């Protein structure tokens, strides 16, 4: 198959409200495992997944190493806000955000499929490492400054060396340590609920609960014809226990049930599911 290690950084300024804040989290596929918050008194890198809280002794220096790396990132982006601000000539009275996402995609053989590093400013693309992991694309003229600084510092090569190196290997170590959580496919618990509106109309809601990974397909049909336009489909939401939820409802006439099949597909299901009231 394919698995991914992904890191997310958010740094934002808050003028007249203290000094800038920097938060960062790490994910193996769709399951967080680490976090860092610069607002904490003595900010440490903290585990956020069960396999990180008990089998993280293999390396007695993991938490110190990651603590210092995260603190350095915190200072880098804290000053970077001042940089991006100067480039655009923006007033310090305003709040602004730098976001970063980087990581690696590994294939079924355990070798790297693709590495990536992307940065946004105020929620819009700012600068990205190209596919060759050797050059940068800056979205506008202000980001050209960052591109020039990073090229003259030879940053892209150290980026590539992390993405093809420590990233892949730590993805493999995490997949091994947390295979009970990460290498699972929990199928959804599915059912249909029935909510009258009038003597003339009823809502039918198709529920998929407690599934992992996040990807799932939920559709209604009437006698065999899709009803994506008529139905209401909420965005997949987490249940707080490390799994996900989704439902899809449709308004149908009273007595006109027993048509309108619900259809669920998920990689944890042996076969796709068909439910009917």
């Amino acid at each position: 198959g394919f698995h991914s290690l992904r890191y997310f950084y958010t740094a934002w300024s808050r003028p007249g409200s203290g000094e800038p804040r920097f938060v960062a989290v790490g994910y193996v596929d769709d399951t967080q495992f680490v976090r860092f918050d610069s607002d904490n008194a003595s900010p440490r890198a903290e585990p956020r997944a069960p396999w990180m809280d008990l089998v993280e002794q293999q390396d007695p220096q993991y938490w110190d190493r990651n603590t210092r790396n995260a603190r350095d990132a915190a200072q880098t982006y804290r000053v970077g806000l001042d940089n991006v601000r100067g480039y655009y000539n923006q007033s310090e009275a305003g709040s602004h955000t730098i976001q970063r996402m980087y990581g690696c995609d590994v294939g079924p053989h355990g070798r790297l499929l693709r590495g990536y590093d992307q940065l946004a400013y105020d929620g819009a693309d700012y600068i990205a490492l190209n596919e060759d992991l050797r050059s940068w694309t800056a979205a506008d003229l202000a980001a050209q400054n960052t591109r020039r600084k990073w090229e003259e510092a030879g940053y892209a090569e150290r980026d590539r060396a992390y993405l093809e190196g420590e990233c892949v290997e730590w993805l493999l170590k995490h997949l091994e340590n947390g295979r009970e959580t990460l290498l699972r496919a929990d199928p959804p618990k599915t059912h249909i609920t029935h909510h009258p509106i009038s003597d003339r109309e009823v809502t039918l809601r198709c529920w998929a609960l407690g599934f992992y990974p996040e990807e799932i397909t939920l559709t209604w049909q009437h006698d065999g014809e899709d009803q994506t336009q008529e139905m209401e489909l909420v965005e997949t939401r987490p249940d707080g226990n490390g799994a996900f939820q989704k439902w899809a409802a449709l308004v149908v006439p009273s007595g006109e049930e027993q048509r309108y099949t619900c259809h669920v597909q998920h990689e944890g299901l042996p076969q796709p599911l068909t439910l009917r009231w």
Partner: peptide
């Protein structure tokens, strides 16, 4: 591992 230092860089 978080990617290391950034050698005190500056966007």
């Amino acid at each position: 591992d978080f990617q290391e230092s950034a050698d005190s860089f500056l966007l």
